[PDB]
Amino acid sequence: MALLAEHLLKPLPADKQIETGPFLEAVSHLPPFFDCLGSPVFTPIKADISGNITKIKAVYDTNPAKFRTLQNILEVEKEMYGAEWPKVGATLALMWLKRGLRFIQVFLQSICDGERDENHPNLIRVNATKAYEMALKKYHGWIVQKIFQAALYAAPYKSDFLKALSKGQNVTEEECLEKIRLFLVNYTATIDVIYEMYTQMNAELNYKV
Amino acid sequence: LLAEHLLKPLPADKQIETGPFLEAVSHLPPFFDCLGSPVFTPIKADISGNITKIKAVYDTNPAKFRTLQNILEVEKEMYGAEWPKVGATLALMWLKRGLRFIQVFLQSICDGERDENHPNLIRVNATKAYEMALKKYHGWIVQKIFQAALYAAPYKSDFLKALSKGQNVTEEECLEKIRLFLVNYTATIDVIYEMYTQMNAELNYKV
Ligand SMILES: CCCCCCCCCCCCC/C=C/[C@@H](O)[C@H](CO[C@@H]1O[C@H](CO)[C@H](O)[C@H](OS(=O)(=O)O)[C@H]1O)NC(=O)CCCCCCCCCCC
Ligand SMILES: CCCCCCCCCCCCC/C=C/[C@@H](O)[C@H](CO[C@@H]1O[C@H](CO)[C@H](O)[C@H](OS(=O)(=O)O)[C@H]1O)NC(=O)CCCCCCCCCCC
């Protein structure tokens, strides 16, 4: 874990445009969040979210100036691929990535807000389930949804998850949550803006895996 | 095709050349794309990962690791406490089980094994393979994950068509070709398992 208060996202400008370059650099630090769950069953997840970032970084690298914002990627790739857009290139990679980013976002906000099953307060299952539901559930068929619920056991204890995050520092659970809460700030704002862009561009697809 | 990329027959001393073992097995991971589902992508990725770790250790010194047995001999001397849960020994320890999964599964279909109520499914075949290669190394969470994924298995007819692809071969001619591949294949795997037993190189930990 890279320390997330050390890798804040940029604030939103008046025009709401997100610079691809700093965005990807920022989000490259996030896939290790899945190592903090403490189980090999989450490694396909880590690998899949990395995949997206890698693809967007690759496309970006081709021409940093033409793909300078995220809005650009969608515009330019639509000229490139025509009718096949948006199921293509970095538009497709950011479509799925924005969903995993929202999972991390809703999940952490949940843990920060103190949400919990009162019967089982050192579990993180209700936080995960809520995150999953409002970020991913909709784009998963029967099989992957059953795979999710199997995988929800083998989620760690809250205290252990929060201890896995805070690694390198000598920081308390409530201080760690302070650093997370500050991260969430431009993180949420930015994810929110990407979702609206997908809606405005008609780049959002509903197909299930 | 698995057909053409046959494994070499074993020599009488039973040592497996590391180079040529890696060439052969490297054709195998596209076995899971014959399953026609994204759910199998992480399986394919794990097997490929084993192959690569072995490929890599081999590459630091081809001559020191001419054989797979050589690999296990060297790495024992090299790590003591950590071995066999280390390096290419761990990679091959797991590769062999995926290899046995493929072996057992294809043998099952070739033998005509089927559920008579669902004869165009391959669920019984995959279960048998899973039970006799992998299941005992998975905890109940992972096993529950296998039983969910099993519903993404393709139909037998489609699965055999994917195996065939470019050919114009019957379902049966396809199977005929697979039987030929299984001969040298089963035997090499058998020998790898045996080497892991003689070397105390086997671990029974569950994931
Ligand atoms: C015997 C045992 C063997 C059984 C094997 C069974 C394995 C089955 C499990 C597979 C699930 C792994 C997660 C990744 C699934 C992915 O398939 C999907 C769609 O994946 C996308 O697909 C696109 C094409 O449609 C592009 O290729 C994308 O890529 S592109 O770069 O080409 O554009 C790619 O990410 N991603 C998504 O569902 C998102 C990833 C999952 C997010 C989950 C986060 C929350 C989880 C809760 C944590 C408590
Ligand atoms: C949206 C919801 C999110 C949920 C997503 C969760 C996805 C679930 C992930 C589990 C499925 C992936 C299969 C991989 C499981 C692996 O955990 C194990 C152990 O794997 C080994 O671990 C070692 C350390 O102990 C080394 O790292 C190995 O490697 S090393 O190279 O580093 O030495 C590594 O292969 N492999 C294995 O269990 C076997 C491989 C799979 C074979 C299965 C074939 C059966 C398929 C049936 C087809 C009909």
Numbering used by the authors:
A (entry chain A): 1 to 209
B (entry chain B): 3 to 209
The authors write:
Human glycolipid transfer protein (hsGLTP) forms the prototypical GLTP fold and is characterized by a broad transfer selectivity for glycosphingolipids (GSLs). In human GLTP, a glycolipid headgroup recognition centre located on the protein surface enables selective binding of the GSL head and ceramide amide groups via multiple specific interactions. Encapsulation of lipid chains within the hydrophobic pocket involves a cleft-like gating mechanism that results in two glycolipid-binding modes. To elucidate the structural dynamics of the GLTP–GSL dimer and associated adaptations, we comparatively analyzed nine novel crystal structures of wild-type GLTP (wtGLTP) and the sulfatide-specific mutants D48V and A47D/D48V complexed with N-lauroyl-containing monosulfatide (N-lauroyl-3-O-sulfo-galactosylceramide; hereafter referred to as 12:0 monoSF) and disulfatide (N-lauroyl-3,6-di-O-sulfo-galactosylceramide; hereafter referred to as 12:0 diSF) in different crystal forms and compared them with previously studied GLTP–24:1 monoSF complexes.
Although the crystal packing differs in various crystal forms, we found a similar dimeric structure in all crystals, indicating the non-randomness of GLTP–SF homodimerization. In crystal form 3, the four molecules comprising the asymmetric unit form two dimers similar to the original C2 dimer. To further assess the intrinsic nature of these variations, two dimers belonging to the same crystal were analyzed for changes in dimer openness. The observed differences are comparable with those found in different complex types belonging to isomorphous crystals. Even within the same complex, 12:0-monoSF–wtGLTP, the θ angle and t distance vary significantly in the different crystal forms (68.2–80.2° and 15.4–19.5 Å, respectively), reflecting changes in dimer openness. In class 2 crystals, N is 2, 4 or 1, indicating the potential structural distinctions between monomers which are not related by crystallographic symmetry.
